[model samples]
Target: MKDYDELLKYYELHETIGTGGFAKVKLACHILTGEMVAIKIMDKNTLGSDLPRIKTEIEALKNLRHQHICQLYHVLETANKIFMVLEYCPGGELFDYIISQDRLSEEETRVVFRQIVSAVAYVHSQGYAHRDLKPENLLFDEYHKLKLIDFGLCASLAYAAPELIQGKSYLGSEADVWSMGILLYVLMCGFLPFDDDNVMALYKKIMRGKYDVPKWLSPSSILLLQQMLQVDPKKRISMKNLLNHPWIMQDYNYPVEWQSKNPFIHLDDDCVTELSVHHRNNRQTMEDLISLWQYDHLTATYLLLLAKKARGKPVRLRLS
Candidate 1:
């Protein structure tokens, strides 16, 4: 018999944070250190053919390790279900943040856009495309740092490229740039560039590449937006080029060193020392447990601590 209860040995489940057709995202605590994480539990029976979608998401999350991408700490499976323990983002969705603020200023937009651009550029560099990049999928940590989440093909038409809207086969990275273009418009204007109550009209607008540019938008942003939202996929700006675009490169103050390292490649000594002393384990012993990377208490605690160390650097003017 499959022992589904094995998960309880390491995590204590709490209230549900999110729910989907076949999965539930529950707030959970690591039993060893009381660190919080989001556990996405999916019923295999309900997944059916969609099972492959979850697998792709796990693969993306596992390898696309950037500061702005959501982290997948572990995966667990049983005869009936699959569990994905993910980074807990309590600040909630960027959609709500945009609504609350009624559109961000160029100064604020630059900060948020740089992070998203960096994350997407990193994803493209890692040989993957988010496929669905929308405000609903972008989350914020307690520090207000943006994190890109939901890597599957959960397409949202509002952010879909014209080629995608036409049901034509499309390159994933190009499609993602189109989505990012919509995302950029939303962040700067607090609304979709194209909107219509009639679904057909909305589709027409997207297909024709029709949208009003706010007069308040900076010249650089207007030019970048034009470059990205091009109806022709070939004409659309590549993520690689977008990184060097004038708007993205403006006020770029993030640490150059931060851009080159994956979060899991190195351990923060301060985090390691604090966790080791708190857990009553020697430094080497805790480090050894972390090296195993098997979703154990020590590793979980260390990751959470490392996130703290990273997010704690709230340099408002910086991009990282």
Candidate 2:
């Protein structure tokens, strides 16, 4: 219910599925309707220092309406805790799915990648940025359908645009595209393009945009990746252009009722599972999500405060 004070009357809190910084992700359900929900539970005291993030996320979700992104159902608070009801994802992170399967075929990768692009593109167009765009941050519902998650990233700095990491300003969607390159690479290979036993070196590799593509990938896929993974944010491919890229577009015709359907959910259970879930409640930094970068990681401190402010930016940059 939208009414914050009347939460427990309508729902019951369940077990701890995941934990984040000073917070916990709990399961719940509507008493009357019997609908399931994932609650982001945190202490009211957490409001003192990180209030803006909690406030920002709630505000962000309110206006956010999309199919690929997870749904935010309701918000409620208690004497010592605040609860956010989000759509529960039963299948776990896309990372785990890929790992479990050992690598995805180009056809399979395209199905999932397309949805991600659609959501991230929509969010950027709505005047917002998802600083965290990693596999763990992504979730699949009871169905095999994929959904983009915000309040993100261990994808520390891997997706960090050059400008954002230099302790300078950067575009959110552009950095998102950078991370998308990482995702494309991972989805197709079941491995990272730039990983190092030494964390700093891995970060350096990302900043330098150093990575290789497997020969097995199609030429068109390679071309699209090269454009998105450019070292300079100025040169980075925008999501708008990605929508038109042949490799991604050849089989994709953007639906007029795009949000009503999910093209990827029909995937077999062997390709995905029901137990994998997002379980973080801690105050997160880009570094935390960089789990991919091993010895892996992705952030900025003021970034939480700065990202939403920069959403009025463009969806893509086309160079003539």
Candidate 3:
């Protein structure tokens, strides 16, 4: 038996980028491509009962393919813990970016929200709900593209819909829409739309659906927020309507369309050519493994290169 973990053979783990109660996300270099990646180390003991949902998350992530969602390249599980190799978003969390910038300009907010809407819309179409749509879960890649990460796990009530806080059996998609509303509000104001000193008070505030719309915000922006933050799920804006909303369409040049590209099964010659040179890879064997979505280094490398190809050239890096 081996004393060391198998992951050590493929990835060179480095500094921790994110930490939570049960798991810590670290930066690692893929030894083959020398490309950056993130490894999430989860303690199985501490995860305990959460294991059931975590498994669901793994299944959800594997099937998900989107430009604005974090890609899961590989997974490693041992008797004591589990390691998930995910896309390394160098720009960090959207929550941190918003706080540092003290709110985004209107145009910038449109750019950010557009990607979110596109990604979440794709998620909804796939018959899954993020269940936790908040700035904290939204991360930016090196190119400043906002990527929606984490799934099948619920987080803070700060972004929770009224139905969720009420202990009611709520529609998952509707609840996600409500959380996105709160996120939109936060993006334009740099603070939570609803706040309280106590937990009960916070729930009450959220249930009432009372929050101030900054007078400085554009009328169109305020209209979208009102549509999304409806106290009644029946009245809240839907994924389809939100995509076509006037506010989201403002100065938007990018296509809002989305569907699975099936990158794992579909081979791109560009990535194929690069991988062939990186290692002595048989073109057909590499293609076959990727098509099978096998947890091998070659498949993982191809996936990372696909992301790098899409990211293209970096922008100015300023929110404005």
Candidate 4:
């Protein structure tokens, strides 16, 4: 997916590594650099509405570069599917690390938290916000650097913002601060600051900003947490103050910044390529038919008839 001119070259597509129902991520390798990447395979027919989100996602991620944010290599679309080549992180999700270690020390959590906030700061500076900032969404690259992913739900407010949950008003950056607080609590304590099996109860707690700080946490951390987890949006901590907080700043003098590029999929803009192709390939024909069937059974049936007529024989899907 590196070279737009090559289409789907320089890579050996391998087994499935992940899935999200309508899409499946596969492990792949680059022929020239011998680099590995995650290929997100999605069906176009089912992408009817998701297509826009995918386009927006690519637009949001493609050019945005940071040590703590996942990278998008390239994008490709044929008649039936869309492929998004992304940087593969072997260290996996931060969730796994938290679960494995049970919990991280205040210092350990600081490093990770620093990266997360740095990424958030970078995104906000770019006129965007990572609305869904959670432990599960935080990832680690080769150097154990925290990278953010999945912008599909970015800029959405759940219980993170009490104002939004209370139907008063909406603020993306403030909501992010809340989620970050919840995440920080989990990182240091190994549990969600707010939780309930019933979502409504969870929502209530979130809106009330009901959470307790254990005595084990440092004074500086508690000070920061209390400010960030403020129940009232009016009293909520601002990003500038957040970055300046003793708990966040410490001895570090780093700023979250990135230099990005425009991609084929620039959100809300008509920038992507045709995103449509007719391969006339037997292997391509079968895969396309099945994908189409999931969307339009009648169209799938018609295409099969056309395929059989072209081959002058009955067609059976070949998987090799």
Which predicted model would earn the best lDDT? 3
Alpha-carbon RMSD to native, per candidate: 5.2, 15.6, 5.0, 12.9
lDDT (10s digit) by residue, model 3, range 1-320: 23126888888989987788878888998776567898888877888999988877888888787888888888778787778888888888998999899999988988888889888888999898888888889999888987888785323788999988898999889999999999999999988989989999999999899998887799998999999999899899889988778887778654566555555456777777666655568887656656776655656777777766766722111122
Superior candidate under lDDT, 1 versus 3: 3
lDDT of each: 0.79, 0.65, 0.81, 0.66
lDDT of 4 by residue, 99-211 (tens): 99998999898888877887887787777777777777787876687778876622223326676677677678887888788788889988878777776887788877768
Residue 311 error for model 3, in Å? 3.9
| Model 2 per-residue lDDT tens digits across residues 4-87 | 445666567788887766577878865533456677776767566776677776777655656777766656666776766676
Choose 1 or 3, whichever is better by TM-score: 3
N/CA/C clash count, model 1: 0
Decide which is better by TM-score, 1 or 4. Answer: 1
Clashing residue pairs, backbone N/CA/C < 3 A, model 1: none
TM-score of 2: 0.74
> On lDDT, who's better, 1 or 2?
1
Deviating ranges (above 4 Å) for candidate 4: 1-8, 153-159, 163-169, 253-320
Best by TM-score: 3
**Model 3 clash tally, residue pairs:** 0
The lDDT ranking, best first, is: 3, 1, 4, 2
